[PDB]
RNA sequence: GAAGAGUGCAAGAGCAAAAGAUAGCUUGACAGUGUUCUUCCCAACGAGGAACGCUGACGCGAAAGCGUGGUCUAGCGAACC
RNA sequence: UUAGGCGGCCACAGCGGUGGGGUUGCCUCCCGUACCCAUCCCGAACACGGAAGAUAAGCCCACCAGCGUUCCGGGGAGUACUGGAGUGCGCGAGCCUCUGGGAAACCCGGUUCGCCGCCACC
């Protein structure tokens, strides 16, 4: 299970690349999503590669982001342990977070919006003109790397 | 053979056994074929249909297992041929087969030949086959008359292995009647 | 005319003589020099001239540089010295020229040129260890008369 | 093995290459059977522009007709070494050709399951001279 | 295109590879298909008759009956539906 | 000696117990009416063209079968009179 | 299939080569023209009639890789070419990094001297 974050805008983006982002439920810059690692899903993120940031987040980090940025299918409402408990098949954020990482359920299945709308990266990111290997922020990241980005977009 | 760009004929073409141009025209009818084939000593008749992995033979007869009903004479002749066709034709009617198209392979359509005799037999056995009466030999030559008249010019007995001297087209008649019976093992 | 007009590879391959008529003859007198009866493996040293950029060299340039290099080997080794140089390229690409304005602009045949990819050996000489410095100088003059920069490279020769 | 390996005469082709025929009359009386016309292909400067038209005649002799004829033809010629085919044939002269080969030849001349005769079972230049010289005359 | 005939730009798709030269096996020319069946369209260079327009080469239609020995196969060119007359010599069962 | 020959004419493609050659016979280069594709990729548009059927009458073959001109893509023309 | 007939795939099956096998069985060669039929001339062939002889051809069986073909290993080669991205380099023709694919020739070594279906038969 990987985490996708849109880091580059739509203007001048190939139409078919932008439509993939929309199929993966992301419509704006700084919007995140969780995707199971399958042959099909893997094809979609490779195509989006040069406009996103992805990787496998740690149990904790995911919990923090879920705590802070997750939302229900409708309305504001804080998604906390109590909320999770009264609406999900779990007991707390952690139970949800564990099931996600293990690809046992989805945010939709539990009645939550598929998208985590993040805040801009505190202290700024590593640039959107180069991949991670060249000192940038685009492409596949480490678990440490993805956590760094997601925790900054707390 | 000579190189990469070289063309090697289909196997049954190298073997000089199948006329593919005639075979196709044969298959276009949609009906099963009546495979009329001869040998120096024998004759053969098969009823073949098309199948996913190769032809399926639904019925057949050989001039050898002819004697099984009464034969005691040569098998590479006219009387032999007709009777083998009728035999095969009857086993066919038994399998639920109703019609066929004559397939003579690499033989020639000479009037009054053995492949035609084979064909007449199967028609007599009750099979619906496209033919032309005035191409089939006259009834007497089928019986083995032409051969009796040959030994009529005796001097030196025609048949080595004794079956008789003047030979018997009557044996042919005995055999035809034996097969026309309904009980007979097929 | 200037080589600036034909040095780059910016057109399709135009070599089919079955559709091109009136192609000028090549100015390249000979491709095999020195002692053609002797073998290449019969020499201790072997130095080739390597082209550094991917370019097109007209037959006029091939003749001029081949000439001015071999002319040196003949001057320093003699009309029958012990060596053998090789121009391993032949001019296949046919050249046009629009010599009315831009109306019906397909040009007429004016020449021929050899296409050489960067890293390929244009010339290759074979000589003994003594004459090794002459072949280098002959090549120095040769790369002075062709478009690209060149590397004089000694292949089999650890007698340096 | 030897019986089904011993040489025989397949045919003797007697032919007269003329150029435009009136020679048929004699070619039949020398052999015994009917002759056949001979046409041509391609245009020729020697006034031979008409493709299909009479030029020569021939007669292919088989069995008795062949030997009986040879019992007069052979004596009329002088056999030589080079005068022999690689397959074991020979021509001399009006021309007279003799095709020889062993028993299992029908295999290559029949229609069904026909096959080319193996190089081994084929007659040889030497095997020919022998068999023929062994029939009323001398070799080289 | 310098011209607009049916065989324009068909040098590659309507030419047999050397080793496949000559007459083709009767088996596939007499094959039988059922309605609703999915079939691939591809002309056999060796078979002259029963051909369709070369543009359609590479399609995958659906058999919807027949007209004589030939078959009526439905396809969608771009966004327009079309019905193609074609013999089994130029057809193959999908899957 | 699997194809370089030949097959009317450009070029590309097809063809070997043939689509080529020879021989013999025959006039299907037939009348009537359609389905489809093409003309015009997708996507509307005439004439023209082709493939594939049906009805009718025939040619050849033992028969399956082949013949809606020439192996395939050029050789074409509205209304009014 | 101890020798047969009809086939599918249509060279992995081609080219060439060695060895083995048949009395009333099989397939052949073979023997022979009164007939059906036949050759623009020939019972050669086509066709008909038949077994004195043979296993030398063909055929069936076992087998050899020199040529040709199929596939595979290692090497060439993650090379050549390439779909997405870059305020990366170069005067420029052009190149390079990241991401996703990925070759041909050739050398060496294996492989391949057909597989499969139906019918009949000691
Ligand atoms: Cl047969
Ligand atoms: Cl069409
Ligand atoms: Mg909402
Ligand atoms: Mg700030
Ligand atoms: Mg920045
Ligand atoms: Mg092309
Ligand atoms: Mg036509
Ligand atoms: Mg007017
Ligand atoms: Mg033997
Ligand atoms: Na002008
Ligand atoms: Na220079
Ligand atoms: Na073919
Ligand atoms: Na029209
Ligand atoms: Na004539
Ligand atoms: Na054999």
Q: Are residues C114 and C56 in contact, defined by beta-carbon separation less than 8 angstroms?
A: yes
Compute CA distances D52 → A62, D27, D36, D39, D40, whole Å: 97, 22, 14, 5, 6
Can you give the distance from the CA of residue B85 to the C1' of nucleotide G60 in angstroms? 28
Contact, B39 CB vs strand G, < 7 Å = yes
Nearest of C56, C72, C89, C61 to residue C135 by alpha carbon: C72
Q: Are residues E47 and E30 in contact, defined by beta-carbon separation less than 8 angstroms?
A: no
Nearest of C122, C123, C119, C127 to residue C46 by alpha carbon: C127
Question: Which CATH number among 3.40.960.10, 2.70.70.10, 3.90.180.10, 3.30.1440.10 corresponds to the domain D1-140?
Answer: 3.30.1440.10
Compute CA distances D12 → A46, C37, D21, whole Å: 83, 58, 20
* Whole-number Å distance between alpha carbons of D44 and E63: 60
Please report where in the chains the tokens 């079309």 appear, as a residue. E82
Closest chain E residue to the Cα of B54, Cα to Cα: E27
Residues A7 and A19 in one domain: yes
Q: Pick out residues 98-117 of chain B having their CB under 7 A from any atom of nucleic acid strand F.
A: 101-102, 104, 106, 109
The H or E element that residue E92 is part of is: strand E91-93
Q: Are residues A35 and A46 in contact, defined by beta-carbon separation less than 8 angstroms?
A: no
Contacts of B7 in chain E (CB under 8 A): 18-19, 21-22
Q: Do E26 and B5 touch (CB under 8 A)?
A: no
Contacts of B11 in chain E (CB under 8 A): none
Q: Tell me which residue in E19, E23, E30 faces B20 most closely, judged by beta carbons.
A: E23
* Whole-number Å distance between alpha carbons of B169 and B147: 9
Secondary structure tally for chain A: helices H, strands E: 6, 5
Can you give the distance from the CA of residue E12 to the C1' of nucleotide G79 in angstroms? 30
Compute CA distances B148 → B42, B165, C132, whole Å: 20, 9, 104
* Whole-number Å distance between alpha carbons of C132 and B100: 90
Residues A120 and A108 in one domain: no
Considering all nucleic acid strands, name the nucleotide whose C1' atom is nearest to the C-alpha of residue B43: G5
Contacts of D113 in chain B (CB under 8 A): 15-17
Q: Are residues D101 and D7 in contact, defined by beta-carbon separation less than 8 angstroms?
A: yes
Resolution of the PDB structure in angstroms: 2.9
Contacts of E30 in chain B (CB under 8 A): 24, 27-28, 50
In this structure, what are the phi and psi dihedrals at residue B181, rounded to the nearest 5 degrees?
-70, 145
Q: Are residues A80 and A93 in contact, defined by beta-carbon separation less than 8 angstroms?
A: yes
Nearest of A56, A63, A68, A145 to residue A98 by alpha carbon: A63
Residue A42: alpha-carbon gap to chain centroid:
15
Strands A139-140 and E60-67: unpaired
Nearest of B45, B53, B29 to residue B82 by alpha carbon: B45
How crowded is residue B125: how many other Cβ atoms within 10 Å of its Cβ? 21
Region of A55 please: left (phi>0), alpha (psi -120 to 50) or beta.
left
* Whole-number Å distance between alpha carbons of A92 and B13: 78
Chains B and D touch (3+ CB pairs under 8 A): yes
Tokens of C68: 């001015």
Contact, B48 CB vs strand G, < 7 Å = yes
Rounded distance from Cα E68 to ligand 10 centre (Å): 60
Residues A53 and A123 in one domain: yes
Chains in contact with B, where contact means 3 or more Cβ–Cβ distances below 8 Å, are D, E
Compute CA distances A22 → A16, A56, A120, whole Å: 10, 21, 20
Q: Give chain B's domain count.
A: 1
* Whole-number Å distance between alpha carbons of C131 and C158: 14
Q: Do D112 and B17 touch (CB under 8 A)?
A: yes
Residues 6+ apart with CB under 8 A from B66: B75, B80, B83, B84, B87, B175
* Whole-number Å distance between alpha carbons of E66 and E39: 14
Domain layout of chain D by residue ranges: 1-140
Handedness of CA A16, A20, A25, A31 (dihedral sign): negative
In this structure, what are the phi and psi dihedrals at residue C48, rounded to the nearest 5 degrees?
-115, 155
Rounded distance from Cα C10 to ligand 6 centre (Å): 22
Q: Helix, strand, or coil here: D106?
A: helix
Q: Pick out residues 31-50 of chain E having their CB under 7 A from any atom of nucleic acid strand F.
A: 45-50
Contact, B53 CB vs strand F, < 7 Å = no
Please report where in the chains the tokens 């001398």 appear, as a residue. D138
Domain around A66: 58-113
Q: Do B15 and D114 touch (CB under 8 A)?
A: no
Question: Which CATH number among 3.20.110.10, 2.30.30.70, 1.20.1090.10, 3.40.50.300 corresponds to the domain E1-95?
Answer: 2.30.30.70
Q: Are residues D41 and D51 in contact, defined by beta-carbon separation less than 8 angstroms?
A: yes
In this structure, what are the phi and psi dihedrals at residue E92, rounded to the nearest 5 degrees?
-145, 140
* Whole-number Å distance between alpha carbons of B129 and B99: 6
Provide the β-strand partners of residue C51.
C150
Class of domain C1-160: alpha beta
Which of B11, B14, B16, B17 would best serve as a mutation to test chain D binding (most D beta carbons within 10 A)? Answer: B16
Closest chain E residue to the Cα of B26, Cα to Cα: E26
Residues A51 and A66 in one domain: no
Q: Do E69 and B28 touch (CB under 8 A)?
A: yes
Q: Do B28 and E23 touch (CB under 8 A)?
A: no
CATH classification at residue A33: 3.30.1390.20
The nearest CA of chain B is from the CA of E78 a distance in Å of 35
CB pairs under 8 A between B and D: 12
How crowded is residue D134: how many other Cβ atoms within 10 Å of its Cβ? 10
* Whole-number Å distance between alpha carbons of E23 and B12: 13
Residues A1 and A53 in one domain: yes
* Whole-number Å distance between alpha carbons of D14 and D28: 10
CATH classification at residue B134: 3.30.420.100
A115-117 sheet: strands from edge to edge: A115-117, A31-35, A2-6, A52-54, A139-140
Half-sphere exposure at residue C75, Cβ-oriented, CA atoms within 13 angstroms: 10
Rounded distance from Cα B183 to ligand 8 centre (Å): 87
> Which bases of chain G come closer than 7 Å to a protein CB?
4-11, 13-18, 24-30, 34-38, 40-59, 68-70, 83-88, 92-94, 97-100, 114-121
Residues A29 and A98 in one domain: no
Residues A133 and A106 in one domain: no
DSSP tag of E12: T
Question: What one-character-per-residue DSSP string does chain E give?
Answer: -----TTTT-TTTTS--GGG-SPPPTTTTS----TT-EEEE---TT--SS---GGGTT-EEEEEEEETTEEEEEEEETTEEEEEEE-GGGEEE--
In this structure, what are the phi and psi dihedrals at residue C80, rounded to the nearest 5 degrees?
-145, 35
Provide the β-strand partners of residue A112.
A72
Residues 6+ apart with CB under 8 A from A103: A1, A36, A37
Residues 6+ apart with CB under 8 A from C116: C51, C54, C55, C56, C57, C89, C122
Give ∠ CA C135-C138-C140 in degrees, rounded to 5: 110
Can you give the distance from the CA of residue C120 to the C1' of nucleotide G67 in angstroms? 36
Please report where in the chains the tokens 């025929």 appear, as a residue. D21
Considering all nucleic acid strands, name the nucleotide whose C1' atom is nearest to the C-alpha of residue B119: F62
Domain layout of chain C by residue ranges: 1-160
Nearest of D10, D26, D27 to residue D98 by alpha carbon: D10
Please report where in the chains the tokens 């006219």 appear, as a residue. B78
Residues A78 and A130 in one domain: no
Handedness of CA B7, B8, B12, B13 (dihedral sign): positive
DSSP tag of A112: B
Closest chain E residue to the Cα of B11, Cα to Cα: E25
Per residue, the 3-state secondary structure of A39-105, as one string, reads HHHHHHHHHHHHHEEECCCCHHHHHHHHHHHCCECCCCCCCCHHHHHHHCCCCCHHHHHHHHHCCCC
Nearest of E76, E41, E33, E81 to residue E60 by alpha carbon: E41
The H or E element that residue A118 is part of is: none
Handedness of CA A78, A81, A84, A86 (dihedral sign): negative
* Whole-number Å distance between alpha carbons of B85 and B37: 11
Please report where in the chains the tokens 């002319």 appear, as a residue. C71
Q: How many residues does chain D have?
A: 140
Chains B and E touch (3+ CB pairs under 8 A): yes
Contact, D42 CB vs strand F, < 7 Å = no
Q: Give chain A's domain count.
A: 2
The H or E element that residue D62 is part of is: none
Query: Closest protein residue to G95 using CA and C1' atoms?
Result: C53
D106 has a chain B CB within 8 A of its CB: no
Pseudo-torsion of CA D56, D62, D68, D73, nearest 10°?
40
Considering all nucleic acid strands, name the nucleotide whose C1' atom is nearest to the C-alpha of residue D113: G58
Q: How many residues does chain A have?
A: 154
Domain layout of chain E by residue ranges: 1-95
Which technique was the structure solved with, according to the deposited record?
X-ray
Nearest of E34, E22, E71 to residue E50 by alpha carbon: E71
Secondary structure tally for chain D: helices H, strands E: 4, 5
Tokens of D103: 């028993």
B21 has a chain E CB within 8 A of its CB: yes
Rounded distance from Cα C144 to ligand 11 centre (Å): 5
DSSP tag of D76: G
* Whole-number Å distance between alpha carbons of A37 and A33: 13
């Amino acid at each position: 299970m990987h985490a996708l974050v849109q880091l580059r805008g739509e203007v001048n983006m190939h139409t078919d690349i932008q439509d993939t982002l929309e199929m993966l439920n992301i419509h704006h810059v700084n919007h995140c999503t969780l995707v199971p690692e399958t042959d099909a899903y893997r094809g979609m993120v490779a195509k989006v590669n040069d406009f996103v940031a992805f990787g496998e987040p740690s149990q904790e980090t995911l919990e923090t982001v879920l705590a802070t940025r997750a939302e229900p299918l409708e309305g504001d409402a804080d998604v906390d342990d109590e909320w999770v408990a009264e609406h999900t098949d779990y007991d707390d954020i952690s139970g949800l977070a564990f099931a996600l990482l293990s690809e046992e359920t989805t945010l939709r299945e539990q009645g939550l919006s598929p998208t985590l709308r993040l805040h801009p990266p505190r202290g700024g990111h590593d640039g959107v003109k180069h991949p991670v290997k060249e000192g940038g922020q685009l492409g596949k990241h480490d678990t440490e790397g993805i956590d760094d980005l997601l925790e900054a977009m707390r | 053979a000579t190189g990469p760009r070289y063309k090697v004929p289909m196997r049954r073409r190298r073997e000089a056994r199948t006329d593919y141009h005639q075979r196709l025209r044969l298959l276009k009818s949609g009906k099963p074929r009546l495979v009329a084939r001869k040998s120096n000593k024998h004759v053969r008749a098969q009823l073949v249909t098309l199948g996913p992995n190769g032809d399926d033979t639904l019925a057949s007869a050989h001039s050898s297992d002819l004697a099984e009903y009464g034969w005691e004479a040569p098998t590479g002749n006219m009387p032999s041929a007709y009777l083998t066709g009728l035999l095969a034709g009857l086993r066919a009617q038994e399998a639920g087969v109703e019609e066929a198209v004559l397939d003579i392979g690499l033989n020639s359509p000479t009037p009054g030949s053995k492949v035609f005799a084979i064909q007449e037999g199967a028609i007599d056995a009750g099979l619906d086959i496209p033919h032309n009466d005035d191409v089939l030999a006259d009834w007497q030559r089928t019986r083995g008359a032409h051969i009796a008249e040959y030994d009529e010019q005796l001097e030196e007995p025609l048949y080595s292995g004794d079956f008789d001297a003047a030979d018997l087209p009557e044996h042919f008649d005995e055999l035809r009647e034996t097969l026309l019976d309904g009980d007979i093992e097929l | 005319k200037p080589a600036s007009m034909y040095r780059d590879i910016d057109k399709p391959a135009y070599t089919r003589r079955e559709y091109i008529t009136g192609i000028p003859g090549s100015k390249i007198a000979q491709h095999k020099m020195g002692r053609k009866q002797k073998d290449a493996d019969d020499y201790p040293v072997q130095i080739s001239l390597i082209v550094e950029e991917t370019v097109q060299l007209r037959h006029g340039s091939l003749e001029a540089s081949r000439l001015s290099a071999n002319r040196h080997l003949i001057k320093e080794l003699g009309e029958e010295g012990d060596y053998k140089m090789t121009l391993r390229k032949f001019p296949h690409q046919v050249l046009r020229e629009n010599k009315d304005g831009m109306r019906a602009a397909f040009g007429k045949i004016v020449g021929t040129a050899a296409r050489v990819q960067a890293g390929e050996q244009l010339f290759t000489a074979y000589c003994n260890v003594e004459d090794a410095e002459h072949v280098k100088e002959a090549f120095r003059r040769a790369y002075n008369k062709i478009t690209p920069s060149c590397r004089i490279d000694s292949s089999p020769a650890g007698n340096a | 093995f030897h019986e089904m390996r011993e040489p025989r005469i397949e045919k003797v082709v007697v032919h007269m290459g003329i150029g435009h025929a009136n020679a048929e009359d004699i070619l039949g009386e020398i052999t015994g059977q009917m002759p056949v016309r001979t046409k041509a292909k391609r245009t020729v400067g020697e006034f031979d522009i008409r493709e299909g038209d009479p030029i020569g005649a021939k007669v292919t002799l088989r069995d008795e007709m062949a030997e009986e004829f040879l019992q007069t033809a052979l004596p009329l010629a002088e056999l030589a070494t080079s005068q022999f085919d690689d397959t074991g044939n020979f021509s001399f002269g009006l021309d007279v050709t003799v095709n020889l080969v062993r028993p299992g030849y029908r295999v290559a001349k029949r229609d069904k399951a026909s096959r080319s005769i193996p190089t081994k079972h084929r007659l040889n230049p030497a095997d020919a001279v022998a068999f023929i010289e062994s029939t009323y005359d001398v070799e080289v | 295109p310098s011209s607009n005939g049916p065989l324009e730009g068909t040098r590659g798709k309507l030419k047999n590879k050397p080793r496949d030269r000559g007459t083709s096996p009767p088996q596939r020319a007499v094959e039988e298909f059922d309605d609703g069946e999915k079939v691939h369209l591809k002309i056999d260079p060796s078979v002259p008759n029963g051909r369709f327009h070369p543009r359609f080469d590479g399609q995958t239609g659906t058999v919807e009956g027949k007209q004589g020995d030939a078959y009526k196969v439905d396809i969608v060119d771009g966004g327009k539906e079309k019905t193609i007359i074609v013999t089994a010599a130029h057809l193959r069962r999908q899957e």
